[PDB]
Amino acid sequence: FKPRNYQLELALPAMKGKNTIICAPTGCGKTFVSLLICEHHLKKFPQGQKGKVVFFANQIPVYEQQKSVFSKYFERHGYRVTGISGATAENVPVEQIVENNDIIILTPQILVNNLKKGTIPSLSIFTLMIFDECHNTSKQHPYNMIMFNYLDQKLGGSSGPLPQVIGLTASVGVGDAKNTDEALDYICKLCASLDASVIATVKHNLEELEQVVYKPQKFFRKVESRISDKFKYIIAQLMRDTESLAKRICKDLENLSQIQNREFGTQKYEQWIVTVQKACMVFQMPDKDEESRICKALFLYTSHLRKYNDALIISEHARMKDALDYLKDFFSNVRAAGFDEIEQDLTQRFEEKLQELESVSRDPSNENPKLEDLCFILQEEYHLNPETITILFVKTRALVDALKNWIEGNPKLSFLKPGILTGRGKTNQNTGMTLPAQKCILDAFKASGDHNILIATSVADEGIDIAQCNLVILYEYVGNVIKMIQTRGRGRARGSKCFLLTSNAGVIEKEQINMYKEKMMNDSILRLQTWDEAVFREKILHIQTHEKFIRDSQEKPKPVPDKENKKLLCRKCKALACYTADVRVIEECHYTVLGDAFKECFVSRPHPKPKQFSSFEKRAKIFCARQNCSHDWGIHVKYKTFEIPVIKIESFVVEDIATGVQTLYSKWKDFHFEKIPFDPAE
RNA sequence: GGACGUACGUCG
């Protein structure tokens, strides 16, 4: 625990009573700098008053690491260190646990909720508000909401003992600015939103700083794509047959979107299929008998087209065998559900060509040249040095499993052990990885462990304790300047590589302008560090006044809701589920329904990941009680002592009884109606 | 169930 020569120079502007934007590229250095700043701040206070330094941390793993190191560093002098999260703030007194403690490591959403309902009426209780990854301050971030409350308390005219912002970062970022005159504007806007006048960056001890944060050399591997594609042809033929079968029941199908020319296996086609799906979900017929079957068949057709587009997107970046395995997994998952006349025709049409797909996929003469170049550079780097660890980055969760399967099923490379980690992702699906499943993978990834290469998603981009890699390879990965710095900064070993393998010149141009934006942000920081403290304070005060005027001017009230009785039909089956006359709002965020006429309209299923949000408990997942629907309506929780199902309007269509038209919403804020609050009775 | 961020992309 020896303080380095650069950490003192980084903390010297912070030990003056002024808010700082300290930016260090190293990992442990920021933690040691925050600990030294906390140690210096908890000693300047005289007798009769103590400090209330609060260190905000977004992610749970980095929060637990910071809490562990803070306890191990401060539980010797009589400094009570605690920590609040979702598994901590169930029924604890938040104001009491803030009062009787000194270092609070809460998660900023909890603090925003506390400032919202009835807790901590003024932020003058704390005296040192440190942020982890302060560059995440953005349009409506929880960090930005805390800073909005701080700026409101400051400019309200009742500014008392305001705390100090020592929010550390690793990269300020440019965002979307082209020129230096807009990059400096964005940096000044971030520095005003964080309410500071000093941006600390190590300049004197650069020779003693470059020995631990040794940056990797980048290498672009732009190569051509596949020319002979006997897989895309037959998949596009099956997609054309499915589209003609969909157009057999819907005459005006081409006029349901504004797409001029669509290509199969593209993001344009993936947008068009969702557009035509949301267009045919609101189809109306004045019989209400065969309309259900028509919309159900149309939903099945659009689901099959979307899955074929996703399979083509997977096959364009990976092999044909794993794409066939994904299609077979989808067909097996839909096979376990009900089987009508509509699904059986698509299933037999897929089974009539599955043998042809397998015979084309088994041929090793049409493999991906991206995967060939990746295996070539991997075996080259492992022949040059066998003790290299890679944190190879792929963007899609459905493609990191593909990369793991390609690494496992390959006779050319046998020294690679998959250590693939994904992350949480969706909280209402049986996908992704859990916190202990990720922690055991991160602990089992050393220089001598049973893992030498892991296929990371974007979870490894943010603040997380990973081993010192030297073989960063980005397989079709595209990001901003912040993502590029956070990805390049991971390979801080004594000699590393930052390979970028894309089949597009667009991603190479994006990486080139990202490096240009990094150099421009460095020049902008060097220019901004030369300004005086008096002019910069007036500039950030003007920017804060303008932002406060913009925030207080755009106060749009709730419009007058249509006090009508409308029914919420199903999104897939278009069956009568319930009315809007009985919709209860629990905590201005969750919407439930009541009555004995709804309990026989849905079925239950065990939930994959049960947890609690703030006061509920994930008990079951609900589904439509039709013959073959299997539609995710919502979830089933227990509020205080009674179980209620809370639904989402996203899997719903709002049909009006008076007029007869049916609209389509996505979120609950867009739906305006006579919302009755939840009563504990009935 | 909800809130938030990033990247790509499509219409106006």
Add this chain to the structure above:
RNA sequence: CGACGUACGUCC
């Protein structure tokens, strides 16, 4: 100069 879709990630 603005909504919308997807993918990814974080949180309550």
